[PDB]
Design a protein around this ligand. Sequence first.
Ligand code: ADP
Ligand code: MG
Ligand code: ZN
Length: 660
Amino acid sequence: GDLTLRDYQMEVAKPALNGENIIICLPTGSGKTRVAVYITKDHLDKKRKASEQGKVIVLVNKVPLVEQHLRKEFNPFLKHWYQVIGLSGDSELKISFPEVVKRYDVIICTAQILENSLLNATEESVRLSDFSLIIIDQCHHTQKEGVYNNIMRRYLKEKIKNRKQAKELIPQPQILGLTASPGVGGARSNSKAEEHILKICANLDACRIMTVKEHASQLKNQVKEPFKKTVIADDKRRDPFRERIIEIMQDIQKYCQLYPKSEFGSQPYEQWVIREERRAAKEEKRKERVCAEHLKKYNDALQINDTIRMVDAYNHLNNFYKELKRRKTAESDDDSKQDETDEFLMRLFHAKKKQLKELARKPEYDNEKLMKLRNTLMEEFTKTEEPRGIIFTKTRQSALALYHWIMDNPKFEEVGIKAHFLIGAGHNSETKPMTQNEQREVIDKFRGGSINLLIATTVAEEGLDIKECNIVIRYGLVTNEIAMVQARGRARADESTYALVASSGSGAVEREDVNIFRENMMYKAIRRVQEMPPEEYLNKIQDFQLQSIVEKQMKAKRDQRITFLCKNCHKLICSGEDIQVIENMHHVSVKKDFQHLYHKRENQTNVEIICKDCGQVWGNMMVYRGLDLPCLKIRNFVVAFEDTKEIFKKWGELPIIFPD
RNA sequence: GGUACGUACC
RNA sequence: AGGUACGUACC
Ligand SMILES: Nc1ncnc2c1ncn2[C@@H]1O[C@H](COP(=O)(O)OP(=O)(O)O)[C@@H](O)[C@H]1O
Ligand SMILES: [Mg+2]
Ligand SMILES: [Zn+2]
């Protein structure tokens, strides 16, 4: 096309075109990135005409956004005129970042790529003075100890150094924040809402926060807000699955004599039962910790029964005991593991297994939210010829299980729905992740039409370019005000709707209302900081900027501060001398006859390392320099000090540095 | 692995 | 403040 702005876009851009630092607040679908390109071209064109050094960096918080901002926005309008490049940690150039800065005029990258070069840690580096404009996308993250705020804390530091050089001149970049909502910072009052707006203004060094006002009617025509529903389920159904699981948990509690001060299937129970597992492992109480381990899995089944279907609660238990069968049973290619407690808990499950399995095949006692979800999907997918939608849910397991729920039900396939899950790429969950490539292909199929309905976690709410939806359902999920408006922003087709499906017992309905309340406070707070006089604004911004510098000085001073027993059976296994590190992350035992203390089972290599005497997971085997080496996960051991017994979730939590 | 942010519950 | 869990992300 040709690079022009709409009247509402020009109204918010104007201060940035005159060199002033600003935050631009534009809704989803408004074209915030197109404003960034117009400002980028305008900024550079002026620097050429004035015979000056022009250089722009566009910082993003996700890797796909580097590629996305190149194709859709920056390359089409700047590639023929200026040197443009996209860069991230995933892309492996054979060029140092300092050289990339020297050769290119527009740099789009993830923020940590800039921070890594500013910090150095390991070798003529980059400074913020090298850039004349810094654009921060999703600038509401310019907060607390996030990369955006560390970059901007360096900016504010050099700003104070520049005042000293006047008295005895290092140049400062222009700064442009881009967001839909700066948010409210979890405030429950208007004062704390306004404070949070001023903090974000202070962190980005904004002369003014900027919203569409004059051309507000035009903006309302461009983006249409969806219709709001709240579909509540009172849960007056009988729940024999809950009742029978509770009887099993009560049976297990009597055996070990561990009694809670909390309801079954609740979050305090989960905290209690995990705490009780940790204590029992430290105190060499195998009976107590094994029962607590099983009790947690039954507590998972209850809360699974609350959110998804009872077959998934059953399969959660059934797979756990299938995994126990594999580890505890003696196989070939080996060198009794079953206690009284192990046999007690196993027999208990097999006794109730018949009833639970067949009770789960009766859909009349299945979750009420599932039928509220069904009825919402059915009426909305028949409404339009070529529909599309997203179901937001909390857990990864619920995303997969809802996908199976839709697949094991041909009436959804009959009505035109073709579902697929969409989850995160991290490896800190008990459910397996989708890779960054698998995420990219599902969203490409979603826009193509091959996939019709995403069942997503918070992966789907911010940043990524997802096709306009006719429906977005928040299935029990209520997070913050920013995520709310972002979810509601995905619903921007003709006749689009936004629906909270939830139970009245969960309290998610009430938390949605507080986020609605907070969203209203945010617009009132933005209005007040804009109407604030310059003398009042500048004083308050300097206070926050000054105390933000002190905040990191405190956290800097905060951060400036044996044998291994098996957690289940307490057998002596390693000394502290035996452990060594590979790639400065994976810890490995190097005892000469370590092989005799563990067995191998399949589920850098998919082979578990389990205790010989009790079948407790210790970690996995790995190949490194052509040597089969045992990797020990710290979670599975009671570390014994000789001066006290403790358990750690990470190797970094130990006060011990290990060799190469 | 390391770190950050969000939510709920202590 | 810190802790537990879920979730997401970046290097
Ligand atoms: N001034 C403009 N003229 C023509 N097209 C525009 C203009 N501004 C934005 N667009 C188009 O609208 C789309 C903006 O959508 P999106 O990127 O979802 O906005 P946001 O990132 O603000 O949610 C882009 O694909 C762009 O081509
Ligand atoms: Mg955009
Ligand atoms: Zn053991």
